[PDB]
């Protein structure tokens, strides 16, 4: 029942492509339809979802598919970069960088402030 | 020689004695290396040609429709560096404006300076937007690779670190080689680019919202030639607006630090004027004798402050300033 | 050392960043065929990043892949394990094996024919490819090298290489559906042997991942342009035995692909033919069948 | 029985009450959106994006400030 | 839809407008499903009716 509608939409193709290939006349009158298609086949020989695209349309379809590939990958990358786990990881890595940068700034600005105080004293 | 080439490598008329020959170097470039493969057409054009033939070429012979914007990328020639997200914000705003307006980007073309930032901006785009470059023919690396009529020549990203010649940016969609007959010398592309930009601006657009096809010139860093072309742009007919992007130093920082404290152009106080003169003389190491000349050239620029637009970063990309200048310089 | 030796050392270390920073620098004098040999070595040892870097440095993949190169790629054992030997042995037993047997292109084409099933016919087993193989073992090259590289990467359990070769080239949804059917077919063949559950579960996971790729690509094509999505779904793929993407999805038993709105409205427009009298139908169809004058009061779609 | 025909002044009071309910509902929705964990994580990551660049600029130009202070102390 | 939300924000008789919009959206969803059209448009109309509700 979780896949009932998917199974129905799957069997829709089977019935549609089955009943497209059947002759027009019902099963009793398939004899007449077989005689008409056999007469057409003998006249042509003894005397629906397969659109055969041209070369330029094939190139346009290929370019459309390549564009769809690129926007799908850009959307996947943007969804990965906007998720909470990647944001938490990049924030923790950045704060790892900041704690060291602020510690260096403080530990060397102490020497800068001491040098400024000594220069103000010796002036 | 005076043309800079080898003494045996031979084969304006003032000291170079040139003769006008038919063109031979035009076709397409197959960019191998540097990531993605990109095809970019090229036509070698003399520096003294008429711009209407270049217009006919760019419309019909190149299958490029007329844009709604001309985003010029005039900047510093030598290679510089920027803040990382300043470059990222500038690149994202540039590509956003370029896809919203369908613009042609008139970037310099050789891979040094602000052109290196524009090619990195197209890496952020990564997937139309013409990038017609106007670089001199004599400065390009592997000139012999570029010879050949209608031939898809291979062009590697082979850049020798000590060579004077500069390889092109591989991510430009189109190229134009300004040939004055010499090699390794700049200035062969400037006048052709200015007359081409004015010939673009004289063509009437289909919408005709403003005055033909509008032009927006973007400036990052630059020397005194940047100030000279800013004066040439502001005093032009029509007066094309100029966006400058500060935070980069050089002439753009001087222009923005003036423009924040200029009021009615020449309404600058004495201490700020002396500070601007001493930063011109010392911070960017210009001569102090020409510092006053650069100051009055700056004031002649500043007499038309309604078209100069700046960008202070601090979200809020440069496309806002580009579209603001687009609405400003449209009449 | 020379640059092929440096690149072989970087391939052995599995450090693509060192090769990008140092080996692929300016001034390098690469010999003739050294980059092709480095590409072959990066392919057989499952180094997807080195293959990416070499493509970014231009090995000319259309010129690199030949018949002998793909035969050496199929016959190699310089990487992860695969079920290809068992499948080749099974199709050779079904057609009618030494341990030093060389897997010909005809044999692995029979492997795709057996795994694909139904009326599928591989390009290798055709008469033109058989006469090319008999006369030689850009005539020996491939017009779509990423197709056969996709097939090679799927058939020897190289998943990340198969994703990379899915990223590059054309006919992407056809490649995704073919990869999904091939992966599920090898999963069913491993489960019919009732082998280890890890390898069969990995093959089923590969088939589900390729099916999810096909579904997401169909969703993107539906979001962009509906008519071009219809043309992408219905057009005849000459390199996949003249099938369509819908037929490859049905052969793959992919319920999520056909349950998409694009293929469903395609099947609905195919189901009613050239008839636009299609609101609360069924009863109107029965009334048109029983009453031949009732057809004239029905709406019909124009040509 | 459930169709009380209100007068004009009561209609105005009911309309003002409904407008007030609209405004407090939208303020509550905005406060709930601004207090959720995802918006907090997004704004924190954007702020730390700004801080890393600001601290890098402060350090890289304070190095020149400290060198200038050391040179001024040496030349005095 | 977003224009309908904005016009819901502005004006009076807001709950009447929301209930009328919910009934209209569900009615067009049922009319599209009675034609058995694409599932995306009918699902969007049902989602609009649920949002207005």
Q: How far is C2 from chain A (nearest CA, A)?
A: 37
Residues of A in Cβ contact (< 8 Å) with B127? 67, 70-71, 74
Chain A residue with the nearest C-alpha to that of C271: A16
| Interchain proximity E14–D26, CB inside 8 Å | no
CA A120 to chain centre: 66
Token look-up 């139908």 returns C281
Q: How far is B289 from chain C (nearest CA, A)?
A: 43
Q: How far apart are CA C245 and CA C270, in angstroms?
A: 16
HEC-encoded secondary structure of chain B: CCCCCCCCCCCCCCCCCCCCCCCCCEEEEEECCCCCCEEEEEEEEECCCCHHHHHHHHHHHCCCCCCCCEEECCECCCCCCCCHHHHHHHHHHHHHHHHHHCCEEECCCECCCHHHHHHHHHHHHCCCCECEEEEECCCECCCHHHCCEEEEEEECCCCCCCCCCECECCCCCEEEEEECCCCCCCCCCHHHHHHHHHHHHHCCCCCCCCCCCCEEEEEECCCHHHHHHHHHHHCCCCCCCEEECCCCCHHHHHHHHHHHCCCCCCCCCHHHHHHHHHHHHHHCCCCCCCHHHHHHHHHHHHCCCCCEECCCCCCCCCHHHHHHHHHHCCC
CB D38 within 8 A of CB E25: no
**Alpha carbon distances (Å) from A18 to A11, A12, A13, A23, E34:** 10, 10, 8, 11, 26
3-state secondary structure at position C49: helix
Phi, psi dihedrals of residue B84, rounded to the nearest 5°:
-65, -50
3-state secondary structure at position C141: strand
C93 touches E: beta carbon within 8 Å = no
Cα-Cα-Cα-Cα dihedral sign, residues D33, D37, D42, D46: positive
CB C42 within 8 A of CB C51: yes
Phi, psi dihedrals of residue D23, rounded to the nearest 5°:
-70, -40
For residue B182, is it left (φ>0), alpha (ψ between -120 and 50) or beta?
beta
A109 touches D: beta carbon within 8 Å = yes
Surface-to-core class of residue B311, CB atoms within 10 Å of its CB (0-12 exposed, 13-18 middle, 19+ buried): buried
Query: Hey, how many other C-beta atoms are within 10 angstroms of the C-beta on B203?
Result: 12
Question: Residues 6 or more apart from E38 whose CB is under 8 A from it?
Answer: C261, C264, C265
Residue B217: beta bridge partners? B72, B242
Chain C residue with the nearest C-alpha to that of B160: C26
**Alpha carbon distances (Å) from B298 to B62, B224, B279, B280:** 39, 10, 14, 11
CB C210 within 8 A of CB C249: no
Chain D residue with the nearest C-alpha to that of A95: D48
* The B132-136 sheet, strands edge to edge: B132-136, B174-179, B38-46, B26-31, B149-155
Across the interface, of C26, C27, C58, the residue whose CB is closest to B32 is C58
B85 touches D: beta carbon within 8 Å = yes
Q: How far apart are CA D21 and CA E14, in angstroms?
A: 10
Q: How far is C192 from chain A (nearest CA, A)?
A: 24
Hey, which chains touch B, using 3+ CB pairs under 8 Å? A, C, D
Chain D residue with the nearest C-alpha to that of B313: D50
Residues, chain E, total?
A: 53
Phi, psi dihedrals of residue B106, rounded to the nearest 5°:
-90, 65
Which of B148, B244, B30, B46 minimizes the C-alpha distance to C62? B30
For residue C293, the 8-state DSSP code is G
Torsion angle, alpha carbons of B233, B238, B239, B245, to 10: -60
CB B12 within 8 A of CB B18: yes
CB C12 within 8 A of CB C50: no
Across the interface, of A14, A53, A65, the residue whose CB is closest to C170 is A65
| Interchain proximity B85–D53, CB inside 8 Å | yes
Q: How far apart are CA B144 and CA B155, in angstroms?
A: 10
Q: How far is D6 from chain B (nearest CA, A)?
A: 51
Question: Residues 6 or more apart from E28 whose CB is under 8 A from it?
Answer: E45
Phi, psi dihedrals of residue A114, rounded to the nearest 5°:
-65, -40
Query: Hey, how many other C-beta atoms are within 10 angstroms of the C-beta on A45?
Result: 7
Which of C172, C179, C174 minimizes the C-alpha distance to C246? C174
Query: Most C CBs within 10 Å: which of E30, E34, E39, as the mutation test of the C interface?
Result: E39
Q: How far is C57 from chain B (nearest CA, A)?
A: 4
Token look-up 């007359």 returns B195
Phi, psi dihedrals of residue C238, rounded to the nearest 5°:
-70, -20
Token look-up 């995802």 returns D38
| Interchain proximity E12–D15, CB inside 8 Å | yes
Query: Hey, how many other C-beta atoms are within 10 angstroms of the C-beta on B101?
Result: 20
CB B197 within 8 A of CB B49: no
Residue B178: beta bridge partners? B45, B136
Find the radius of gyration of the CA atoms of chain E: 12
| Interchain proximity C279–E34, CB inside 8 Å | yes
Q: After which residues is chain A broken (C to N over 2.5 A)?
A: 47
Alpha helices in chain E (DSSP H): 2-9, 14-34, 39-52
Residues of A in Cβ contact (< 8 Å) with B126? 70, 74
Interface of B with C (CB under 8 A): 32-37, 158-161
Q: How far is A58 from chain C (nearest CA, A)?
A: 9
Q: How far apart are CA A50 and CA C244, in angstroms?
A: 7
| Interchain proximity D57–B83, CB inside 8 Å | yes
DSSP track, C116-128: H-TT---STTSHH
Residues of B in Cβ contact (< 8 Å) with D46? 315
Residues 97-136 of B with CB under 8 A from A: 126-127
Hey, which chains touch E, using 3+ CB pairs under 8 Å? C, D
Query: Hey, how many other C-beta atoms are within 10 angstroms of the C-beta on C17?
Result: 10
Which of C190, C189, C210 minimizes the C-alpha distance to C116? C189
Chain A residue with the nearest C-alpha to that of C222: A68
Residues 37-56 of A with CB under 8 A from D: none
Q: How far apart are CA C104 and CA D62, in angstroms?
A: 69
Burial B143-165 (b: 16+ CB within 10 A, else e): eeebeeeeeebebbbebeeeeee
Q: How far apart are the first and last CA of chain D?
A: 97
Resolution (A): 3.2
Phi, psi dihedrals of residue A11, rounded to the nearest 5°:
-75, -15
Which of E38, B128, A76 minimizes the C-alpha distance to C229? E38
């Amino acid at each position: 029942k979780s896949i009932s509608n998917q199974v129905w939409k799957f069997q829709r193709y089977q019935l549609i492509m089955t009943f497209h290939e059947r002759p027009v006349l019902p099963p009793p009158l398939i004899i007449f339809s077989h005689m008409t298609m056999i007469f057409q086949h003998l006249c042509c020989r003894w005397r629906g979802l397969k659109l055969f695209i041209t070369d330029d349309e094939l190139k346009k379809v290929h370019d459309f598919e390549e564009q769809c590939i690129e926007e799908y990958f850009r959307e996947k990358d943007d969804r990965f970069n906007s998720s909470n786990d990647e944001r938490i990881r990049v924030t923790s890595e950045r704060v790892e960088n900041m704690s060291m940068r602020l510690e260096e700034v403080n530990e060397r600005e102490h020497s800068m402030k001491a040098s400024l105080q000594t220069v103000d004293i010796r002036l | 020689c005076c043309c800079g080439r080898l003494i045996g490598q031979h084969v304006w008329s003032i000291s170079k004695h040139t003769q006008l020959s038919p063109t031979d170097a035009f076709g397409t470039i197959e960019f191998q290396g540097g990531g993605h493969s990109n095809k970019a057409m090229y036509v070698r054009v003399s520096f003294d040609t008429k711009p209407d033939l270049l217009l006919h070429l760019m419309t019909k012979e190149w299958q490029l429709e007329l844009p709604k914007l001309l985003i010029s990328v005039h900047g510093g020639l030598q290679n510089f560096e920027l803040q990382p997200k300043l470059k990222q914000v500038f690149g994202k705003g540039l590509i956003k404006a370029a896809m919203t307006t369908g613009a042609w980007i008139f970037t310099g073309g050789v891979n040094t300076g602000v052109i290196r930032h524009v090619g990195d901006a197209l890496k952020d785009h990564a997937s139309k937007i013409c990038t017609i470059g106007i670089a001199p023919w004599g400065i390009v690396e592997n000139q012999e690779d570029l010879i050949g009529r209608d031939v898809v020549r291979p062009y590697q990203t082979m850049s020798n670190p000590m060579s004077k010649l500069t390889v092109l940016n591989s991510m430009h969609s189109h190229f134009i080689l300004a040939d004055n007959g010499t090699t390794g010398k700049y200035g062969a592309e400037v006048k052709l680019r200015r007359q081409l930009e004015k010939h673009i601006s004289l063509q009437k657009i289909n919408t005709r919202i403003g005055q033909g096809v509008p032009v927006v010139a973007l400036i990052v860093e630059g020397g005194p030639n940047v100030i000279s072309i800013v004066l040439e742009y502001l005093r032009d007919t029509p007066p094309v607006p100029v966006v400058v992007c500060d935070g980069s130093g050089r002439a753009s920082d001087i222009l923005a630090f003036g423009h924040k404290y200029s009021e009615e152009g020449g309404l600058i106080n004495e201490s700020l004027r002396d500070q601007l003169l001493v930063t011109i003389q010392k911070t960017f190491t210009y001569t102090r004798t020409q510092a006053q000349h650069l100051f009055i050239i700056l004031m002649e620029c500043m007499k038309k402050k309604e078209l100069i637009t700046v960008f202070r970063m601090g979200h809020q990309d440069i496309d806002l300033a580009i579209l603001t200048a687009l609405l400003k310089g449209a009449n | 050392a020379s640059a092929p030796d440096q690149l072989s050392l970087a391939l052995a270390w599995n450090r693509v960043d060192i090769a990008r920073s140092q080996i692929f620098i300016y001034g390098q004098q690469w010999p003739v065929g050294s980059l092709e040999q480095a590409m072959l070595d990066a392919l057989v040892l499952d180094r997807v990043d080195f293959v990416k870097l070499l493509i970014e440095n231009g090995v000319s993949m259309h010129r690199f892949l030949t018949i002998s190169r793909l035969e050496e790629l199929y016959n190699t054992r310089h990487g992860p394990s695969n079920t290809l030997y068992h499948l080749v042995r099974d199709v050779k037993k079904r057609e009618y094996l030494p341990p030093d047997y060389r897997i010909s292109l005809i044999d692995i084409g029979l492997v795709i024919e057996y795994l694909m099933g139904g009326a599928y016919r591989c390009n290798y087993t055709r008469k033109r490819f058989r006469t090319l193989y008999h006369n030689l073992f850009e005539i020996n090259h491939f017009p779509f090298p990423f197709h056969e590289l996709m097939v090679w990467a799927v058939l020897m359990k190289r998943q990340k290489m198969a994703l990379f070769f899915w990223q590059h080239g054309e006919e992407a949804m056809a490649k995704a559906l073919v990869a999904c059917k091939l992966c599920k077919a090898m999963a069913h063949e491993a489960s019919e042997n009732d082998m280890v559950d890890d390898i069969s579960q990995e093959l089923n996971h590969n088939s589900r991942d390729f099916g999810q790729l096909a579904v997401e690509l169909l969703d993107q094509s539906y979001k962009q342009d509906e008519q071009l999505a219809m043309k992408l779904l219905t057009y005849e793929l000459k390199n996949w035995s003249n099938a369509t993407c819908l037929q490859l999805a049905v052969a793959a038993k992919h319920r999520d692909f056909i349950a998409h709105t694009c293929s469903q409205m395609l099947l609905t427009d195919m189901w009613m033919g050239r008839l636009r009298m299609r609101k609360n139908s069924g009863l109107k169809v029965i009334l048109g069948i029983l009453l031949p004058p009732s057809i004239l009061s029905l709406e019909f779609k124009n040509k």
